[PDB]
Design a protein around this ligand. Structure first.
Ligand SMILES: NC(=O)c1ccc[n+]([C@@H]2O[C@H](COP(=O)([O-])OP(=O)(O)OC[C@H]3O[C@@H](n4cnc5c(N)ncnc54)[C@H](OP(=O)(O)O)[C@@H]3O)[C@@H](O)[C@H]2O)c1
Ligand SMILES: NC(=O)c1ccc[n+]([C@@H]2O[C@H](COP(=O)([O-])OP(=O)(O)OC[C@H]3O[C@@H](n4cnc5c(N)ncnc54)[C@H](OP(=O)(O)O)[C@@H]3O)[C@@H](O)[C@H]2O)c1
Lengths: 393, 395
């Protein structure tokens, strides 16, 4: 009939190559089909200076309110960026300023095409990975190193001893994890499982670290039965605590949520999702990058071929979450459909240099093998058009 | 030839299940017909290990420690499943570890690369040698408090505290972990010794940016050892050592042909070699990277055909013998060691291979019987091709 009513959504504008494909994804993949009621924020490096990172904070508050946000890729400043752009301060990361105000866990997932040679040729259903995510010093010249814990209620303090250096020279460490951060890593990663209809795996190392790692399985399992237990059976699922060496072993044709604590998977097909505990709130970024090299030669008369999929899926993840949240079937379907066409366009034999580069090595690639950033973008639209007409009648 | 070659004091350790069989086959067909040895063989098979009460395991370590060379077969590592299976009276520790425990040193893995076998990068022509550097005090934070590490040199000229963190919501866990300077210097040597033993360049990857003080010590000490001694031998042998960051090390490897030692701070399995290089640079324990290959052994017991790649096992020998010959300046053995390695690859590049290697070239569903040789066939091929090479070698 006409454009689908999506709802409240937080967009974030990036910078460099990715911004170009971002403001290209919109016009002919999203915008012609979905009426978005959107709060966009410009995280373009330049804009981030004007507002003095304030605009970043705001987008973070934005998400926390409306529960759903996408994000383009954004420069994180180091020494060059200050000289190149002339920044006024060593601006922090756009992520983090977000992360440290939202919590939850990052979930990285590769996008699998039958055309693409993967590590362990047989991984059909992809694997979702959620890495949990430091006070070191030198100990020059022999002494005694001891970690101490002194409780709040003024009861007996507890000294420990992390080896004393009898004969000199060393280096020492101290790290930790608060209970509540273990609780957030649990739900996020319990919630996630139901949200894919896939089984969960916490892989630890409690045999060695008895009281550190032990505690993760001592906070996971318990929160697995108190709630979320029946739900897995209600979805034909299970959660096992595995063990690092057995998980790097049994992984299988794939299709699970690997929740581990402690060059592979190609680049332009690595989507990320930040899942907040509540289950309600979610953020989606293709966590791959601004792709500066490509932009460098885009700003020149030269032509580029750049893989848009990751960012395309960043949208379809976030939108799928609105529909899930709001019970918006019409939207939900379209999200799935966008994803479907993306993969299918690839599997049909139309792609960019980097995906062709996986087939036939870099030296063997020729021009007749891939479409460029622009001509890949049309092909997606054309086929999306096609796909959409088909589902109507 | 004429007669065998005298190789001398070597220490042999035997394993379990499928390896053991091919391990014997190796000896029968490839080493013994050609080489005489003062063998200090210890039988580390699960049954025997239980019979001895794992004394035989510690007995091997000390022998390696004395005789410098040790070629180890695989071996079962006990868990509840095995404990029931063999009716073990205890769940003994992994031999490999116990061996490592008494010896120290640094393990280096190598994938044996041949021209008709696919790689991660089609660029890699020469092998890449990766060496892994390998308790902490860990405890639970009862409730809200302030955990903090604190150091005191034992000559009261400082007391330095840091915050790991103060818990205000409370609960949680915490742990501190030292690293002895000694362990770093050892790591250095071994992975400088090995850089010359194979005559390639050395790269140490780290995460300096994040742990400026921790990783920072790994960079500095490698440098001191590289210069207080090792720099000379390096430059002489037209090679270099050069620290790198982990980020731009991964990509730098893709754009290469391999052929370097990569020190690291944290293809088929049947092509994976593992060598434990001690800091003294005299002791070495070779072994395959895989296990006892239980699934293959199970079929062998039911009368089915197996197709098990021995290469990894074969290379433990050749590697070990190469080391013994290097220590003893035995040019005859030194040559023989390269020959068996020379034959092994040459045989595979000639289209004769096990089922695993076929799978690499074609893919599981697309492999037929006519494409590969079984365990016992592949062995013959090698022995026949081996005897061949050795005849034309006499010239
Ligand atoms: N905010 C974020 O989510 C995020 C994430 C990562 C990096 N960054 C920022 O990126 C800036 C510097 O870029 P970088 O050096 O890290 O490069 P990058 O964007 O991480 O990409 C590095 C290489 O990955 C390949 N690649 C990535 N995406 C691709 C795609 N869609 N299509 C084709 N190839 C793709 C390209 O390799 P080829 O050279 O072979 O073409 C590119 O040169 C830094 O300021 C960093 O902070 C931001
Ligand atoms: N001492 C050691 O160095 C060591 C190391 C690791 C494991 N182990 C012992 O191994 C026992 C269990 O075996 P596992 O499950 O670990 O099997 P494994 O020997 O580690 O190998 C697992 C699978 O890899 C393939 N494979 C391994 N080596 C091969 C070769 N040489 N040629 C062709 N294919 C090969 C086979 O897969 P396909 O069946 O699909 O062909 C095999 O089933 C454990 O009890 C463990 O203690 C010992």
């Amino acid at each position: 009939s006409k454009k689908i009513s999506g709802g409240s959504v937080v967009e974030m504008q990036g910078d460099e190559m990715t911004r170009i494909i971002w403001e290209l994804i919109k016009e002919k993949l999203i915008f012609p089909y979905v009426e978005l009621d959107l709060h966009s924020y410009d995280l373009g490096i330049e804009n981030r200076d004007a507002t003095n990172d304030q605009v970043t904070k705001d987008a973070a508050e934005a998400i926390k309110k409306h529960n759903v946000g996408v994000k383009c890729a954004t420069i994180t400043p180091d020494e060059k960026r200050v000289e190149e752009f002339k920044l006024k301060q060593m601006w922090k990361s756009p992520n983090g300023t977000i992360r440290n105000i939202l919590g939850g866990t990052v979930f990285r997932e590769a996008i699998i095409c039958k055309n693409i040679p993967r590590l362990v040729s047989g991984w059909v259903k992809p694997i979702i990975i959620g890495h949990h995510a430091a006070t070191d010093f030198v100990v020059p010249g022999p002494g005694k190193v001891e970690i101490t814990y002194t409780p709040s209620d003024g009861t007996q303090k507890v000294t420990y001893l992390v080896h004393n250096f009898e004969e000199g020279g060393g280096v020492a460490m101290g790290m930790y994890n608060q209970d509540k951060s273990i609780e957030d890593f649990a739900h996020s990663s319990f919630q996630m499982a139901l949200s894919k209809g896939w089984p969960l795996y916490l892989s630890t190392k409690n045999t060695i670290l008895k009281k550190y790692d032990g505690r993760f399985k001592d906070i996971f399992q318990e929160i697995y039965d108190k709630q979320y237990k029946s739900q897995f059976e209600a979805q034909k699922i299970w959660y096992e605590h595995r063990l690092i060496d057995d998980m790097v072993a049994q992984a299988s044709e794939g299709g699970f949520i690997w929740a581990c604590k402690n060059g592979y998977g190609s680049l332009g097909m690595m989507t990320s999702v930040l899942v907040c505990p509540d289950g309600k709130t979610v953020e989606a970024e293709a966590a791959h990058g601004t792709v500066t090299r490509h932009y460098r030669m885009y700003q020149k008369g030269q032509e580029t071929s750049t893989n848009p999929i990751a960012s395309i899926f960043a949208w379809t993840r976030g939108l799928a979450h609105r529909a899930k949240l709001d019970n918006n079937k019409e939207l939900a379907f379209f999200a799935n459909a966008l994803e479907e066409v993306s993969i299918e366009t690839i599997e049909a034999g139309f792609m960019t240099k980097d995906l062709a580069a996986c087939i036939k090595g870099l030296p063997n690639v020729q021009r007749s093998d891939y479409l460029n950033t622009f001509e890949f973008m049309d092909k997606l639209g054309e086929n999306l058009k096609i796909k959409l007409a088909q589902a109507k009648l």
